[PDB]
Structure formats: C-alpha cells, structure tokens
C-alpha cells in the first residue's frame, strides 16, 4: 500500500487547494494567556488508580 507515505505531505495541499484565506499569519497569535499555567499535550499525569475507589473519591471529592 504505502510507498512514500510518512505524513503523506501531499495532502494538506491537494485538499486545501481551496486557497485558504491566507490569513495564516493573522491566524491568532494573541489569545495566549493561560499557557503560563495549564499545560499538557506532551506528558499529562493522573494514573487514575482504577479499582473504582478512585471513580468515587473523584466523582465526589476530586
């Protein structure tokens, strides 16, 4: 099947050939604010010791 897949790359264009507003530079770059406190998408933490005991100590105290 694959032969040069790897991210494909030849996709975001063939489909976003729509042109795209091009405002890419003005995407947003501003709303940033809670980025100095809440963090994730890299190595979250929780484990969540199942046994359900945590499903309660949490579904109630948390």
């Amino acid at each position: 099947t694959v032969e040069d897949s790897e991210s494909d790359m030849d996709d975001a264009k063939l489909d976003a050939l729509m042109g795209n507003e091009g405002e890419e530079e003005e995407d947003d770059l501003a709303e940033i604010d809670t980025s100095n406190i809440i963090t994730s998408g890299r190595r979250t933490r929780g484990k969540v010791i199942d046994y359900k005991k945590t499903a309660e100590e949490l579904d109630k105290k948390e």
Binding site: S7, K13, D15, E21, D27, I38, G41, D50, K52
Partner: protein, 192 residues
C-alpha cells in the same frame, strides 16, 4: 472500520507509550470520541458559522465552540496549545510541510478534508482552523490514552481495554459529562 486514524494513532500509540497495542474497540471509542469531539467542535463552529454567515471557519469559530464544548479547563489548555500552535506553525510559513510544521503529525489534510466534505459550505479552512482541530485532538486524544495507557499498563495489561476507559472516562466527571460516547464494553458502572 475502514482505516480510521489507526496509523497516525499507532504513531501516537508507540510514542505515548511503547507498550500499548491498544484494544481495537478502545481504538473505536477513542476514534469515536476523536471523531465525535471532532464533530462537536467543527459542528458548533460550523453552526455559529452557518448562522453567522461567517463561513470562514477561523480559530475564533472553533475557539468559541471549543470554549462552549469543552467544560473549560480542558478548553483552557486546548486554546492555549491551539494558539501557540498557529504561531510556531505560521512562524515559518506554509513553505515546508503542514504535516510537519503544524507540529502535529495528526491528519492535517484528511481532517481538513472532513471540514471540506462535511462542511462543504464555502469552508476555505484558513490555517486558523485545521490546526486548531489537530491540536485539540492530539491534546485530548493523547490525554485519554495517556491516563489509560500509563495506567492500563501499570494496572495489569499493556493492551488497554474499554474498562481502563470506564475510569479514564466515567472517572473524570468533566470528560464523562463530555465524552458519554459509548463505553458499551467496559462501562460496567450501572447495571451489574
């Protein structure tokens, strides 16, 4: 079943954890979530946009949805990671590789396609969107798998099952009230 985000996930599966052959259905629930949360957002975005005539689904459209969708805390990080993303993503320029510049090896063109075929409403999908969707997915997608992944293996088996999800999902009240997708296999919480 078709193909699902099996491959790329498989990449976020080995990366999130090297011992995670993940249960097929756990791949269906996540995929269903990832697919459902993909809609919940892009749906409301496409909603407050179909009514606003905005049509131009920008970061602000999905941001609000994300803000109205996600309980908030998750959103707070979903919008923080999504913003910083357009930055490093646009910092250079779409002159290298979106499936590498977005900083997210998640289907940027295939999902962008889910926005073109599903929305098909003059949705140009400015760089101010497709990424916000790949960023929020890898965020919660990697999160649900991170909790159950590092836990399902520290609990008993590397091949997580809808059960470890029963917790990772019904456990986190927020997500629960937000996922409530299926859990029809490990959600052994009500009827015994």
């Amino acid at each position: 079943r078709k193909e699902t985000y099996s491959s790329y996930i498989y990449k976020v599966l080995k990366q999130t954890h090297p011992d995670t052959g993940i249960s097929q259905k756990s791949m269906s629930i996540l995929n269903s979530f990832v697919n459902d949360i993909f809609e919940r957002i892009a749906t409301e975005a496409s909603k407050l946009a179909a009514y606003n005539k905005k049509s131009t689904i920008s970061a602000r459209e999905i941001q609000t949805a994300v803000r109205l969708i996600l309980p908030g805390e998750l959103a707070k990080h979903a919008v923080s990671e999504g913003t910083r993303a357009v930055t490093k993503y646009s910092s250079s320029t779409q002159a290298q590789s979106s499936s590498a510049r977005a900083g997210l090896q998640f289907p940027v063109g295939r999902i962008k396609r889910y926005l073109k075929r599903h929305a098909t409403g003059r949705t140009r999908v400015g760089s101010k969107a497709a990424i916000y969707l790949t960023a929020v997915l890898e965020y919660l997608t990697a999160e649900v798998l991170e909790l159950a992944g590092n836990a399902a293996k520290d609990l008993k088996v590397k091949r997580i099952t809808p059960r470890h999800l029963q917790l990772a999902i019904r456990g986190d009240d927020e997500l629960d009230s937000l996922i409530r997708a299926t859990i029809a296999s490990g959600g052994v919480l009500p009827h015994i």
